[PDB]
Design a protein around this nucleic acid. Structure first.
Lengths: 336, 350
DNA sequence: GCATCCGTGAGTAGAGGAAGCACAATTTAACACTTTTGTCAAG
DNA sequence: CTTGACAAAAGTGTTAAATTGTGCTATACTGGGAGCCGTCACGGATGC
């Protein structure tokens, strides 16, 4: 039932490494990485391609590039003479060592991840994001420096967890640099609050933040940092009323607005009948009543074969006739 | 939904279905000639985590020696269950004994038992009982200032191992290049090295030791057992509904009332699938539909605040976990990390 | 025969309700300049 | 209905400055934390 307890039971089956065990695996991984590079130089293949082929054999057939070419490339590696076959064995043992080194340090990420709960991600999500940092640390670790593994891996495990919080904890994503500004702004207001005995104003916050900050910038940053509210949140004690029941829809036109649009079109059509055949047709093209989009004076000219300036005077004349009829009927002013 | 439609078709209990779906037990899809506890393994058999590793990887255990004391067992000696390796601890299984980290190396020069102390940052490069010519490295080190080299020719002896590893395998000495590499799987009769001179006699995983220039085959099988909904989907695709219907009709003639009632309930689900034209494997999702955005809106209220529906947060969780699983698979992550991600993905869909 | 699991329980109305930093990639805004498009005066 | 204009509104590179995306940090650190009974009562269906 409990996924957290199942994971803790599984990682407890891998015993912690000793100092001698830790050093040997790190040396094998470092030597294994070096042997793959030489093989690519000798064989003329892509180093990233060789590592995948070596990694696939170690992991076995239980993992879903097509396998038809994996086995063919493996024959190429094995067809080298003994002088070159040693690099293949060193590469194989290195990848096996890398798998063992990762699995033995799964308790380290758990102890770190427990200090980041309550910040928008679940405990199992923090653990899986910290496991990615542990994988990166194995790649970059150097055992010549005589430092222990947990000294270096702790930097990479914390970074992965912290970055994942800044990228997944908000419905409306906020960039990493802006997230850091919001966190710094909250620390400052907390310190001033315990010093002034009351909530600070935006002018005190801006002065403590430093140069480049005024009260207007403080208010805009606080407005950005607001999280949306759920449509399904209840109000009251009884559970039959929710936020979404009080929010009108303002995108679809109302029945009243749909009817006045059609009433206006019908009255506009009857006015245009008083015009001539071309005077009305030119007016509709220019205003965009037929296709929905207006057409240039030249575009109307090309439709009828006439010049640009001809359209301007005939289009203007039709307007004068419409204004003259309009003043004698007052059937069109209410729609305005 | 009781009773489960998947469980009825596959003849699986409710508790057995939960153990496979949520990554708690394996199910066998291809035994590959594996024997467990002297009993051959059959299909549709549920394996625990300990059982699966024993079949797939083999038996081995490491016994930590107390500091200072010396092992009574030579390196590469076959031992038996109950045989005491150290004066304080005993072996719990039979197999080959191996030295892990010899703290002191003793060389018998030819002219002379000199003793060298080995640090955790130093590794021995020569095997036990090796005739090492003058100038050849005996113990390697990070800094050549502390490195130990051979003053004269002699035989190297290893002493004071940190721990003893006992593994059930077969050891094949060789002289020329080997035909296999670490991580390969072999069957009896397969060539190992020396152009067919050395051949394996048992199934197992092969690892090649370059210091001891021997080949070890850890006794294990290439068994096909899987967990999760991907294993359940495999079983549902192989069902022959016509063949299952004829078997259930024969059980319908049993004298027992209980047998006839159980066969009727299984037949009702089978009949529904045959007549409708649906496929049983469509009950496992491969692509998840997404609701249109206007039915799960994100709207700005009159005051400037935003309002959103719960479905958006449930979709975001699934997408985040789906993307992380892809990156973990491309990085060659270990099976413990991968299994955790897959269990989280199933729960996100639920 | 009994232990375990699962879905069901009237209607309308109201009225409150916690890291930094360095640096590379990418997006945006500013600014000119070229081209297109109306007006005006003829005619 | 057609020419010559005429400035204007709009379109088109060019570029510096905001803005955003990403990698990295070497003393040693290696299995969570909140719950916590007027626990609702009764019928139906399933599995022993």
């Amino acid at each position: 039932s409990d996924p957290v307890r199942q994971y803790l039971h599984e990682i407890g089956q891998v015993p912690l490494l000793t100092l001698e065990e830790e050093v040997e695996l790190a040396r094998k991984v470092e030597e294994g990485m070096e042997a793959i590079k030489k093989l690519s130089e000798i064989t003329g293949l892509d180093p990233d391609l060789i590592r995948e082929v070596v990694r696939a054999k170690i992991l076995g057939s239980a993992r879903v590039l097509d396998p038809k070419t994996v086995e063919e490339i493996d024959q190429k590696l094995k067809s080298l003479p003994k002088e070159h076959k040693r690099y293949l064995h060193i590469a194989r043992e290195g990848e096996a060592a890398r798998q063992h080194l990762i699995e033995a340090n799964l308790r380290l990420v758990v102890s770190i991840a427990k200090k980041y709960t309550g910040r928008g991600l679940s405990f199992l999500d923090l653990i899986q994001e910290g496991n990615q940092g542990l994988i990166r640390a194995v790649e970059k670790f150097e055992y010549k420096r005589r430092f222990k593994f947990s000294t270096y891996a702790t930097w990479w495990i914390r970074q992965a967890i912290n970055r994942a919080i800044a990228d997944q904890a908000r419905t409306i994503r906020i960039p990493v640099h802006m997230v850091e500004t919001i966190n710094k702004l909250s620390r400052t207001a907390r310190q001033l609050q315990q010093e002034l005995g009351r909530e600070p104003t935006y002018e005190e916050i801006a002065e403590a933040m430093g140069p480049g900050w005024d009260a207007k910038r403080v208010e805009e940053t606080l407005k950005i940092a607001q999280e949306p509210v759920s449509l399904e949140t209840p109000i009251g004690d009884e559970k039959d009323s929710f936020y979404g029941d009080f929010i009108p829809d303002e995108h679809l036109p109302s029945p009243v607005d749909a009817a006045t649009q059609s009433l206006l079109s019908e009255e506009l059509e009857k006015a245009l009948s008083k015009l001539s055949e071309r005077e009305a047709m030119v007016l509709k093209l220019r205003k965009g009543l037929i296709d929905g989009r207006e057409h240039t004076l030249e575009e109307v000219g090309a439709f009828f074969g006439v010049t640009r300036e001809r359209i301007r005077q005939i289009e203007n004349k039709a307007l004068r006739k419409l204004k003259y009829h309009e003043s004698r009927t007052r059937k069109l002013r209410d729609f305005l | 939904d009781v009773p489960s439609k998947i469980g009825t078709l596959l003849d699986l209990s409710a508790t057995e279905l939960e153990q496979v779906l949520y990554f708690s037990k394996y199910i066998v899809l291809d035994p590959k000639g594996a024997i467990l506890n002297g009993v051959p393994v059959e299909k549709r058999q549920l394996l625990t985590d300990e059982e699966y590793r024993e079949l797939r990887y083999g038996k081995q255990e490491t016994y930590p020696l107390p500091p200072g004391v010396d092992a009574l067992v030579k390196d590469g000696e076959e031992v038996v269950k109950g045989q005491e390796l150290a004066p304080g601890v005993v072996s719990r299984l039979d197999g080959v004994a191996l030295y892990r980290f010899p703290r002191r190396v003793r060389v018998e020069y030819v002219k002379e038992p000199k003793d060298y102390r080995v640090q955790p940052h130093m590794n021995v490069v020569v095997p036990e009982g090796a005739r090492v010519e003058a100038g050849d490295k005996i113990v390697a080190a990070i800094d050549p200032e502390e490195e130990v080299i051979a003053e004269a020719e002699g035989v190297v002896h290893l002493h004071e191992p940190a721990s003893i590893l006992v593994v059930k395998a077969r050891v094949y000495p060789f002289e020329d290049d080997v035909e296999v590499s670490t991580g390969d799987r072999v069957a009896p009769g397969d060539v190992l090295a020396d152009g067919g001179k050395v051949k394996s006699d048992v199934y197992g995983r092969v690892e090649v030791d370059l210091v001891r220039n021997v080949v070890r085959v850890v006794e294990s099988y290439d068994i096909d057992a899987r967990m999760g909904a991907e294993a359940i989907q495999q079983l549902l695709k192989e069902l022959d509904l016509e063949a299952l219907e004829k078997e259930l009709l024969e059980e319908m003639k049993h004298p027992s009332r209980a047998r006839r009632a159980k066969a009727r309930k299984r037949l009702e689900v089978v009949r529904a699938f045959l007549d409708s034209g649906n496929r049983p494997e469509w009950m496992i999702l491969e692509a998840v539909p997404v609701l249109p955005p206007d039915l799960r809106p994100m709207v700005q209220v009159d005051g400037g605040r935003f309002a959103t529906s719960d479905l958006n947060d449930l979709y975001r969780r699934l997408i985040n976990r789906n993307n992380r699983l892809k990156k973990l698979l491309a990085q060659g992550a270990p099976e413990i990390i991968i299994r955790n991600e897959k269990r989280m993905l199933q729960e996100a869909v639920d």
